[PDB]
Amino acid sequence: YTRVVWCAVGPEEQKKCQQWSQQSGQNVTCATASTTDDCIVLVLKGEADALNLDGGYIYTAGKCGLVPVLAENRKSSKHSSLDCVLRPTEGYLAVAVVKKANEGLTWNSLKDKKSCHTAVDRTAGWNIPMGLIVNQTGSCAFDEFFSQSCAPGADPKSRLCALCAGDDQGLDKCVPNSKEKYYGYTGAFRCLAEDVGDVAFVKNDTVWENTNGESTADWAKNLKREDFRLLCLDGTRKPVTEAQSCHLAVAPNHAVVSRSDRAAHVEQVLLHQQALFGKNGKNCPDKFCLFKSETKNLLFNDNTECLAKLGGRPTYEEYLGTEYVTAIANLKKCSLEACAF
Ligand SMILES: *[C@@H]1O[C@H](CO)[C@@H](O[C@@H]2O[C@H](CO)[C@@H](O[C@H]3O[C@H](CO)[C@@H](O[C@@H]4O[C@H](CO)[C@@H](O[C@@H]5O[C@H](CO)[C@@H](O[C@H]6O[C@H](CO)[C@@H](O)[C@H](O)[C@@H]6O)[C@H](O)[C@@H]5O)[C@H](O)[C@@H]4O)[C@H](O)[C@@H]3O)[C@H](O)[C@H]2NC(C)=O)[C@H](O)[C@H]1NC(C)=O
Ligand SMILES: *[C@@H]1O[C@H](CO)[C@@H](O[C@@H]2O[C@H](CO)[C@@H](O[C@H]3O[C@H](CO[C@@H]4O[C@H](CO)[C@@H](O)[C@H](O)[C@@H]4O)[C@@H](O[C@@H]4O[C@H](CO)[C@@H](O)[C@H](O)[C@@H]4O)[C@H](O)[C@@H]3O)[C@H](O)[C@H]2NC(C)=O)[C@H](O)[C@H]1NC(C)=O
Ligand SMILES: *[C@@H]1O[C@H](CO)[C@@H](O[C@@H]2O[C@H](CO)[C@@H](O)[C@H](O)[C@H]2NC(C)=O)[C@H](O)[C@H]1NC(C)=O
Ligand SMILES: [Fe+3]
Ligand SMILES: [Zn+2]
Ligand SMILES: [Zn+2]
Numbered sequence: 001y002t003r004v005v006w007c008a009v010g011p012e013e014q015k016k017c018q019q020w021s022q023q024s025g026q027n028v029t030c031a032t033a034s035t036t037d038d039c040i041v042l043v044l045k046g047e048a049d050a051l052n053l054d055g056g057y058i059y060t061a062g063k064c065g066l067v068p069v070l071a072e073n074r075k076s077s078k079h080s081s082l083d084c085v086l087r088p089t090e091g092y093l094a095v096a097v098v099k100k101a102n103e104g105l106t107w108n109s110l111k112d113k114k115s116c117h118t119a120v121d122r123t124a125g126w127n128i129p130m131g132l133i134v135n136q137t138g139s140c141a142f143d144e145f146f147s148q149s150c151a152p153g154a155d156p157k158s159r160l161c162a163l164c165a166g167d168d169q170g171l172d173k174c175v176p177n178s179k180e181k182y183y184g185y186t187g188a189f190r191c192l193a194e195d196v197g198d199v200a201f202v203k204n205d206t207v208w209e210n211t212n213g214e215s216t217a218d219w220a221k222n223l224k225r226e227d228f229r230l231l232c233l234d235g236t237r238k239p240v241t242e243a244q245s246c247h248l249a250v251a252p253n254h255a256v257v258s259r260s261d262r263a264a265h266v267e268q269v270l271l272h273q274q275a276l277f278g279k280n281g282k283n284c285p286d287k288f289c290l291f292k293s294e295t296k297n298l299l300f301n302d303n304t305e306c307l308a309k310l311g312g313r314p315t316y317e318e319y320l321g322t323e324y325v326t327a328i329a330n331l332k333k334c335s336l337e338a339c340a341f
Pocket of ligand 3 (some may be wrong): 023024026027080272276
């Protein structure tokens with residue numbers, strides 16, 4: 001038992017982590033890096049213990065020997081009497097979203113159009129859709145498929161960063177942290193919402209949490225579901241209500257990882273942390289709520305009900321599942337057995 005050092009990605013996560021730190025009596029402390037990759041490195045080194053990660057990063061981290069510990073769990077309909085911490089995770093739907101007004105734009109006419117990605121190496125924003133495109137075009141030149149994009153994490157001076165905007169001042173353009181205006185699920189959807197891009201690769205949930213009054217953000221308060229369409233892989237367009245029948249894939253939930261030798265320890269502390277600041281926790285919303293950051297998805301997704309135990313002590317390949325791991329492998333041949341660091 002003891003203190004857990006969390007790794008925050010960028011200045012906004014840092015500010016929230018510090019709040020969490022103060023409220024916890026320093027039972028959790030904070031380290032900060034500029035990218036998710038740097039955070040993986042801090043954990044490897046032992047300078048940080050844990051962070052929450054999208055599936056695409058669970059993959060990077062796993063080659064380097066880090067393990068899944070607890071997974072994000074959101075509101076469910078199947079598997080009903082079980083307590084949240086013990087309910088199995090559902091996964092989320094990776095979808096491609098466009099404006100209704102942009103008529104005649106289908107999966108089969110995406111070439112040379114403008115795109116919005118959560119960030120390079122992420123599941124819904126990059127791995128799935130780009131894996132799909134490489135496989136469909138028989139080419140590895142996925143950097144030449146779209147005319148312009150905002151793909152946080154690519155080369156700032158490449159076309160994959162042409163549509164990114166940086167921070168309030170124009171700095172940090174295309175950085176894969178929340179300082180970049182078009183970063184993450186929310187940033188990518190905003191990129192489409194403001195007609196900077198033609199299509200956004202996000203998840204089912206993002207469309208719903210940022211339309212019809214669900215978000216009071218300047219850019220989203222007037223957004224309406226009917227104004228959006230999902231691009232299905234059979235060439236059709238469907239309303240956002242039909243995501244169960246019109247998605248690119250189902251993604252494994254974001255999860256907390258740590259070095260294997262710290263797993264038990266990290267797990268113990270966080271379960272107690274969530275009993276205090278989680279969905280129905282003792283001090284939320286009284287003093288501090290771990291799963292809220294006003295639609296910004298800082299440290300955790302805002303729609304998380306709880307962090308769930310992984311039943312069955314998964315390796316990272318089992319957590320991701322065989323379907324998703326094959327996809328990432330085949331796509332990374334474009335740009336076997338080794339840790340990136
Ligand atoms: C896309 O992403 C979005 C965003 O994440 C998802 O939208 C969210 O999804 C959740 C659920 O998935 C939404 O529901 C939330 O609000 C509920 C309303 O209070 C909360 O409680 C639930 O209510 C459900 C019904 O609304 C319950 O389900 C059942 O309802 C049946 C009614 O037909 C009922 O049937 C009985 O009673 C009937 C009377 O009408 C009889 O006719 C029948 O005979 C039968 O006896 C069942 O008993 C049962 O109640 C459910 O059990 C819950 O209690 C709850 O808090 C929940 O979270 C959420 O609002 C929504 N978010 C937003 C902002 O839209 C969406 O799901 C995603 N879609 C995909 C494809 O993944
Ligand atoms: C890009 O193209 C790539 C090349 O095609 C894709 O990589 C391919 O991905 C495929 C699907 O993920 C893999 O094919 C699978 O083929 C068999 C079918 O899956 C099985 O289904 C049974 C249910 O009946 C399950 O029980 C079982 O677990 C499998 O999931 C699999 O063969 C099986 O082998 C067992 C014995 O081990 C046998 O008894 C079963 O009958 C069954 O036939 C096989 O293992 C695969 O799962 C391809 O392997 C994979 N190809 C390559 C070259 O990597 C890639 O996904 C494409 N990208 C996208 C985005 O789609
Ligand atoms: C610091 O962590 C410890 C361990 O969970 C907490 O102190 C515990 O308080 C609980 C009551 O919730 C007792 O049952 C345990 O005996 C205590 N453990 C120890 C090791 O003393 C405490 O809640 C945490 N403090 C903060 C700020 O979260
Ligand atoms: Fe994701
Ligand atoms: Zn499906
Ligand atoms: Zn196993």
